[PDB]
RNA sequence: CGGGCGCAGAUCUUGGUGGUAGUAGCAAAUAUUCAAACGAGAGCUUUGAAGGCCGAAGUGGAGAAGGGUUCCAUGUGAAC
């Protein structure tokens with residue numbers, strides 16, 4: 001279908017590898033935004049503010065190695081923008097990342 | 108809009124710094140109509156402008172040492 | 173300075189009233205001969221002495 | 222007003238003009254030479270791709286110091302940049318020329334950029350502050366732009 | 374008949390315009406990010422949240438000299 005919602009595990013550690021200390025957290029959100037465009041083939045990615053708190057949870061340079069993320073592709077429903085769809089990216093607090101697969105959620 | 112006059116007027120009404128003034132993001136259009144100190148006081152009484160609490164500087168560790 | 177003399181404050185009052193642009197109806201009077209006030213001063217780029 | 226290269230058939234042609242535009246002349250001349258002979262819709266798609274940097278503007282004449290890109294091979298050239306400022310002003314003039322063809326009653330889908338030139342406008346005066354108490358001129362290079370679009 | 378009568382030069386004078394050149398450059402004092410609002414238009418405005426800095430010999434709060442309306446509200450976004 002068009003409106004879909006899945007949960008991913010973004011390995012942020014390997015995407016911010018080699019970035020300066022003052023740019024690791026801002027680059028992580030640019031990698032999360034790129035991740036949402038790659039998987040969910042829709043530009044205009046909107047990152048939840050709770051996810052911005054999660055990447056910045058331990059400062060600008062100590063970014064969590066992984067992040068459980070839920071990608072919810074929705075309709076813009078305004079018709080003022082060219083993109084009909086958009087990916088609303090949220091944060092999923094998990095206790096452990098071991099064995100977490102990519103799964104779809106219900107509506 | 109530009110809530111710079113209200114951020115300044117509320118800091119003098121609440122007698123706090125501009126870093127402690129909280130303007131409701133959902134009522135930015137209502138606070139934008141406040142152009143005086145009396146209207147700011149009304150927005151504080153309505154809960155749309157509150158003084159954020161002081162950041163905690165607990166002396167528990169030094170008192171423990 | 174806040175501490176001013178009456179002569180200095182009276183001098184600054186005259187320069188403050190001359191720093192006004194020309195009236196719009198002046199350009200219709202002189203036939204657009206005076207296009208702007210060439211004696212406009214700014215408080216940074218030109219001082220009074 | 223007083224265009225160069227008056228059209229071959231003024232009935233099937235629309236004109237658009239712009240003076241004292243604050244684009245860089247050198248960046249705009251290279252952008253104007255890119256959209257010359259293109260259709261009105263191809264010129265728009267090309268200029269919109271320069272803004273998003275999907276295809277470059279080859280810098281032919283004013284190419285001193287400009288870098289090389291992979292998109293320059295599309296024009297059989299080595300140097301090319303993406304003058305977003307020049308792409309927007311030329312995109313605003315293509316929009317005006319297209320609206321002039323509508324008022325004239327021309328087939329907008331058949332328009333081709335016949336003539337397009339970018340002149341130098343009176344340079345604007347600003348100043349920079351150099352060492353040893355010297356002031357050097359910091360001059361803008363605005364431009365006059367005109368274009369003729371004809372039917373094909 | 375009378376000259377302030379003929380320019381390529383004088384590191385000539387004044388004014389204008391080039392190549393250099395879309396070049397040098399916009400690299401001192403750790404830092405920004407998400408969302409939203411207004412808006413034709415937003416990395417830069419505002420609001421909130423987050424993460425940072427100045428760390429009371431402050432990047433804080435008030436004066437003197439000096440400035441002279443730079444103060445404040447509103448509007449504009451040409452020029453700076």
Ligand SMILES: [Mg+2]
Pocket residue numbers: 216
């Ligand atoms: Mg000064």
Ligand SMILES: [Mg+2]
Pocket residue numbers: 353354
């Ligand atoms: Mg000096």
Ligand SMILES: [Mg+2]
Pocket residue numbers: 377
């Ligand atoms: Mg002589």
Ligand SMILES: [Mg+2]
Pocket residue numbers: none
């Ligand atoms: Mg000569």
Ligand SMILES: [Mg+2]
Pocket residue numbers: none
């Ligand atoms: Mg006044």
